[PDB]
Design an enzyme around this catalytic site. Sequence first.
Site, short mmCIF file in Angstrom:
data_model
loop_
_atom_site.label_atom_id
_atom_site.label_comp_id
_atom_site.label_asym_id
_atom_site.label_seq_id
_atom_site.Cartn_x
_atom_site.Cartn_y
_atom_site.Cartn_z
N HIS A 45 -3.67 1.65 0.94
CA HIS A 45 -3.33 3.23 0.93
C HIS A 45 -2.66 3.71 2.32
CE1 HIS A 45 -7.37 2.83 2.33
NE2 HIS A 45 -7.45 4.09 2.47
N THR A 48 2.48 4.56 3.26
CA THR A 48 3.34 3.65 3.87
C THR A 48 2.91 2.23 4.64
OG1 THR A 48 3.40 5.12 5.79
CG2 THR A 48 5.21 5.53 3.73
N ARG A 49 3.81 1.49 4.76
CA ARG A 49 3.97 0.04 5.48
C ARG A 49 5.25 -0.43 5.90
NH1 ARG A 49 -0.53 1.36 4.34
NH2 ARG A 49 -2.38 0.23 3.92
N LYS A 265 3.59 9.55 11.23
CA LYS A 265 2.68 8.95 10.74
C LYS A 265 2.34 7.93 11.84
CE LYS A 265 0.53 5.51 7.88
NZ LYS A 265 0.67 4.48 6.77
N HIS A 269 -3.16 -0.11 16.49
CA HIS A 269 -3.24 -1.45 15.74
C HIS A 269 -4.22 -2.59 16.49
CE1 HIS A 269 -1.93 -4.93 13.38
NE2 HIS A 269 -1.39 -5.59 14.46
N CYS A 315 -8.73 2.64 6.55
CA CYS A 315 -8.56 1.44 5.81
C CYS A 315 -8.92 0.32 6.49
CB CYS A 315 -7.07 1.86 5.43
SG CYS A 315 -5.92 0.33 5.49
N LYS A 348 3.83 -6.37 4.01
CA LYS A 348 5.13 -6.43 4.01
C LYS A 348 5.52 -7.86 3.30
CE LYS A 348 5.14 -6.68 8.28
NZ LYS A 348 3.86 -6.85 8.79
C1 FAD Z 1 -5.42 -0.90 6.53
C2 FAD Z 1 -4.04 -1.06 7.26
C3 FAD Z 1 -3.43 -2.11 6.89
C4 FAD Z 1 -2.29 -2.28 7.32
C5 FAD Z 1 -1.24 -1.18 7.88
C6 FAD Z 1 -1.94 -0.21 8.19
C7 FAD Z 1 -3.47 0.21 7.96
C8 FAD Z 1 -4.04 1.31 8.30
N1 FAD Z 1 -0.19 -1.17 8.19
C9 FAD Z 1 0.75 -2.34 7.84
C10 FAD Z 1 2.02 -2.43 7.92
O1 FAD Z 1 2.67 -1.56 8.47
N2 FAD Z 1 2.65 -3.55 7.50
C11 FAD Z 1 2.13 -4.73 6.76
O2 FAD Z 1 2.77 -5.77 6.54
N3 FAD Z 1 0.61 -4.63 6.79
C12 FAD Z 1 0.29 -3.52 6.99
N4 FAD Z 1 -1.43 -3.45 6.87
C13 FAD Z 1 -1.97 -4.85 6.39
C14 FAD Z 1 -1.91 -4.80 4.72
O3 FAD Z 1 -2.12 -3.31 4.35
C15 FAD Z 1 -3.03 -5.53 4.21
O4 FAD Z 1 -2.65 -7.01 4.88
C16 FAD Z 1 -3.16 -5.92 2.59
O5 FAD Z 1 -2.99 -4.63 1.99
C17 FAD Z 1 -3.91 -6.90 2.26
O6 FAD Z 1 -3.76 -7.12 0.85
P1 FAD Z 1 -4.99 -7.59 -0.10
O7 FAD Z 1 -4.43 -7.72 -1.29
O8 FAD Z 1 -5.64 -8.68 0.58
O9 FAD Z 1 -6.08 -6.32 0.14
P2 FAD Z 1 -6.10 -5.29 -0.77
O10 FAD Z 1 -4.83 -4.58 -1.39
O11 FAD Z 1 -7.23 -4.31 -0.20
O12 FAD Z 1 -6.60 -5.98 -2.21
C18 FAD Z 1 -8.17 -6.31 -2.43
C19 FAD Z 1 -8.46 -5.90 -3.83
O13 FAD Z 1 -9.65 -6.69 -4.33
C20 FAD Z 1 -10.43 -5.87 -4.94
N5 FAD Z 1 -11.70 -6.47 -4.90
C21 FAD Z 1 -12.51 -6.50 -3.72
N6 FAD Z 1 -13.86 -7.26 -4.13
C22 FAD Z 1 -13.77 -7.30 -5.45
C23 FAD Z 1 -14.61 -7.85 -6.26
N7 FAD Z 1 -15.80 -8.49 -5.99
N8 FAD Z 1 -14.29 -8.19 -7.66
C24 FAD Z 1 -13.10 -7.56 -8.00
N9 FAD Z 1 -12.18 -6.97 -7.22
C25 FAD Z 1 -12.46 -6.92 -5.82
C26 FAD Z 1 -10.38 -4.58 -4.18
O14 FAD Z 1 -10.90 -3.38 -5.22
C27 FAD Z 1 -9.00 -4.51 -3.98
O15 FAD Z 1 -8.18 -3.81 -4.71
#
Ligand code: FAD
EC number: 1.5.3.1
Length: 387
Positions: A45, A48-49, A265, A269, A315, A348
């Site tokens: 969330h 933006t990324r 924004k 990092h 996040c 990304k």
């Molecule tokens: C946090 C952050 C990350 C970030 C960024 C700025 C911030 C503040 N800026 C970025 C940027 O400019 N460019 C880029 O390429 N990356 C950037 N990032 C990193 C990127 O957002 C993260 O690497 C990415 O979102 C990682 O994705 P992933 O799929 O690993 O993580 P998620 O989207 O959080 O999804 C995980 C999901 O799994 C679920 N979950 C967790 N535990 C369970 C269990 N037990 N059972 C079922 N589901 C589960 C979560 O609910 C979640 O939806």
Amino acid sequence: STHFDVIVVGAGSMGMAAGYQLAKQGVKTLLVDAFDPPHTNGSHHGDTRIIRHAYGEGREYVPLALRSQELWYELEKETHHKIFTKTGVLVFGPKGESAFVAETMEAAKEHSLTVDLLEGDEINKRWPGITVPENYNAIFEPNSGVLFSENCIRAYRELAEARGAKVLTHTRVEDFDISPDSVKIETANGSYTADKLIVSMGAWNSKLLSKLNLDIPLQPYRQVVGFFESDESKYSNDIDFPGFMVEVPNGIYYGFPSFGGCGLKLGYHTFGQKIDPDTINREFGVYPEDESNLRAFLEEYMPGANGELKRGAVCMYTKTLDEHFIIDLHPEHSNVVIAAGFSGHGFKFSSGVGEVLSQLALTGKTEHDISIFSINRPALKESLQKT
Ligand SMILES: *Cc1cc2c(cc1C)nc1c(=O)[nH]c(=O)nc-1n2C[C@H](O)[C@H](O)[C@H](O)COP(=O)(O)OP(=O)(O)OC[C@H]1O[C@@H](n2cnc3c(N)ncnc32)[C@H](O)[C@@H]1O
Ligand SMILES: [Cl-]
């Protein structure tokens, strides 16, 4: 009584992209998420990324970045949700004192990427609103930019569901039962089986991979971002202010131009609080560093974007020891695929990773070079719990 071809645990950035890739090929898929993606409890969330292409982190990253870019353009054409804006991405830092800037320049050269090199006052002149010392240099990529991450997940989900993918929300997977010819997950809402399993739980990989007999150092960090009232005549996307990721003496910062007046924004990092995904305080401002580390950068480098705080978000990053991703088959189960440790820079690549995960789950291999993401590499310090 419902078996699936593939089950995806964690339907976020990586999992939802994988779900879309699988559904598109007629693969009976079940995606299970602890919440209802896109949401504000994971790592996607904040709206933006940044997507950049001159990835000095490792050559394997460039092809994946370019493929992901093409995939994002494809997604843009398939949905009504906005996916990408070509803001360009500016990288700058003290001349001869930034490995990040240096690696970026080397990566661009090595892959023949289109970039502009400038330094000192040329930076301040090209982008009114930026004030860097004269001894700073920069590399600008005009064709990379900004992804609307919640929109991406939302689009992949709608497209996957339209093709038959099932998404089970608000369901936390608590355990796994892996067999040589099937996989099974356990949740409070019931158990499900499939031929293949993709595990992409984001920050929760640091707590639950142990249920798959894996011991891999993964540290979640609390990372905040703030939106600030800015001089729109300088920092708006409309006047071509770029997305950026830069290195200054105290670390790396990244940011986005104001879109429709939302304000510039910014995120710091290289620093974040070590936390646990189930006890992290998701309120912006509870630590004085949340807002102060941001303004310290703004007052010095983008002084006209240091107005009232309009919005904040909290996040998480989940880091591996070498900050490279983990994308590979489970070492003891070829029918289990792992996507973990994106270390703060995986969004990304999520479109490309979804494609890789799909290939690994269906064929046990991928056409992409993913050796640097091996779950068996030494720098990762990976081990099995029971051997
Ligand atoms: C946090 C952050 C990350 C970030 C960024 C700025 C911030 C503040 N800026 C970025 C940027 O400019 N460019 C880029 O390429 N990356 C950037 N990032 C990193 C990127 O957002 C993260 O690497 C990415 O979102 C990682 O994705 P992933 O799929 O690993 O993580 P998620 O989207 O959080 O999804 C995980 C999901 O799994 C679920 N979950 C967790 N535990 C369970 C269990 N037990 N059972 C079922 N589901 C589960 C979560 O609910 C979640 O939806
Ligand atoms: Cl991450």
